[PDB]
């Protein structure tokens, strides 16, 4: 989690040091074997080579699987970023255009109707429920902070996946090079280089066991964290957003509550009233100047655009797409990363066994 001292971190560290103790017992087993063989057949080497080839292959499969999983997680985060960015742009544009509409309505009324000054009550009415609409739309949840934190998480996971991809392909390359130099030493007469590469192989064994440790730690941590993630997302993020909206988004396979149809109804009725009053101004604009009629027709098309924007908005608030993105992210984390990372754990175990067998076949050369 966030702090550096708790049971979860201690549990993961205990698993890691248990794997390190496994590495230690492996190395002391190697030491006792070497001292026993210094105190006073091709089948095993062939089996070791086949096992190490199978290990590196299954590890490459696991790394590709986790690469694909992280890639689709980043894709889902990108879709969520796009959706919230579109929501934010739509709401900001609607507010900005509404303010512009208020100011231009004030201008066109002062230009013409100020001479008569009889529909001042109507003008005050439009002003008052326009302000009511502004207040009601101010109640929508702004999505700037979630976009910022999700972009930060996307950057972090991109960096982490790039680092892991590079490091583990380095590990695959090193394993292949060790296999090739083993074959070359088997064929060509053993030079001192076969005595030099023994320490390199031992260090690579140590690295493989450390990989097993970190792999098991990450696997258990991620599995436990995404077993019931909803509580974690509520705790870490649900501070400036009320719990009901978060629970709606995280769990809306059915229409649980959806406590926002009142807002859509009030905007729809406000806009219908706006259409009615605009039509009233048109039908009072017959004896007036054509400039008033042109402005009114422009306002009518403007209201049409506002209505279609509101329809796009209410399409975007519906939790189908966001819930689909969440479910895709959840499955791509657990059901993909866990399995790939476990396959990588089997990689580490099999590679450790393979190095053990090669060291078993080490001293017998000379
Ligand atoms: C979603 O991910 C994209 C990553 O491609 C990021 O979008 C950000 O949105 C801004 C606009 O608000 C974009 O600005 C773009 O960059 C040029 C740079 O000169 C700018 O002048 C233009 O206005 C152009 O639209 C840009 O794609 C990006 N901003 C950055 C990278 O600083 C962002 O991570 C996410 N979008 C959000 C959070 O709105
Ligand atoms: C903004 O949208 C409104 C409606 O959404 C439109 O203004 C006028 O709307 C009425 C009612 O929909 C239209 O009357 C109907 O026209 C159809 C055309 O096929 C006709 O079949 C019906 O019997 C009825 O008469 C009216 O035509 C329409 N005004 C214009 C100029 O088309 C219009 O889409 C937008 N208002 C503008 C551009 O001023």
Author numbering: 34 to 73, 89 to 414
Published text:
Tweety homologs (TTYHs) are conserved transmembrane proteins present in all eukaryotes including three members (TTYH1, TTYH2, and TTYH3) in humans. TTYHs have been reported to form Ca2+- and cell volume-regulated anion channels structurally distinct from any characterized protein family with potential roles in cell adhesion, migration, and developmental signaling. Each protomer consists of five transmembrane helices (TM1–5) and an extracellular domain (ED) which extends 75 Å from the membrane surface between an extracellular N-terminus and intracellular C-terminus. We conclude TTYHs are not pore forming subunits of anion channels and their function may involve Ca2+-dependent changes in quaternary structure, interactions with hydrophobic molecules near the extracellular membrane surface, and/or association with additional protein partners.
To test this, we purified and reconstituted TTYH2 into lipid nanodiscs without Ca2+ and in the presence of EGTA to maintain low free Ca2+ concentrations for structure determination. We also pretreated filter paper used for EM grid blotting with EGTA to sequester the high residual Ca2+ known to be present in this material to prevent Ca2+ transfer to the TTYH2 nanodisc sample. The Ca2+-free TTYH2 cryo-EM data did reveal a change in oligomeric state, but surprisingly we identified two different conformations in approximately equal proportions: the expected monomeric TTYH2 (to 4.0 Å resolution) and an unexpected head-to-head homodimer (a “trans-dimer” to 3.9 Å resolution) in which TTYH2 protomers embedded in separate nanodiscs associate via a buried surface at the distal end of each ED. Protomers within monomeric, trans-dimeric, and cis-dimeric TTYH2 adopt overall very similar conformations (pairwise protomer r.m.s.d. = 1.3–1.5 Å) with conformational changes largely limited to subtle rearrangements of side chains. The pocket and unassigned density is similarly observed in TTYH3 cis-dimers, TTYH2 monomers, and TTYH2 trans-dimers, suggesting it may be a conserved site for binding small molecules or extended and primarily apolar lipid headgroups. In contrast, it is exposed in TTYH2 cis-dimers and monomers with ~250 Å2 of solvent accessible area presented to solution by each RGD. Notably, reported human TTYH1 and TTYH2 structures determined in Ca2+-free conditions are also cis-dimers, while we observe monomers and trans-dimers of mouse TTYH2 prepared in Ca2+-free conditions here. For dissociation of cis-dimers into monomers, these include: (1) the affinity of TTYHs for Ca2+, (2) the related dependence of TTYH oligomeric state changes on [Ca2+]ext, and (3) the range of [Ca2+]ext experienced by TTYH-expressing cells under different conditions.
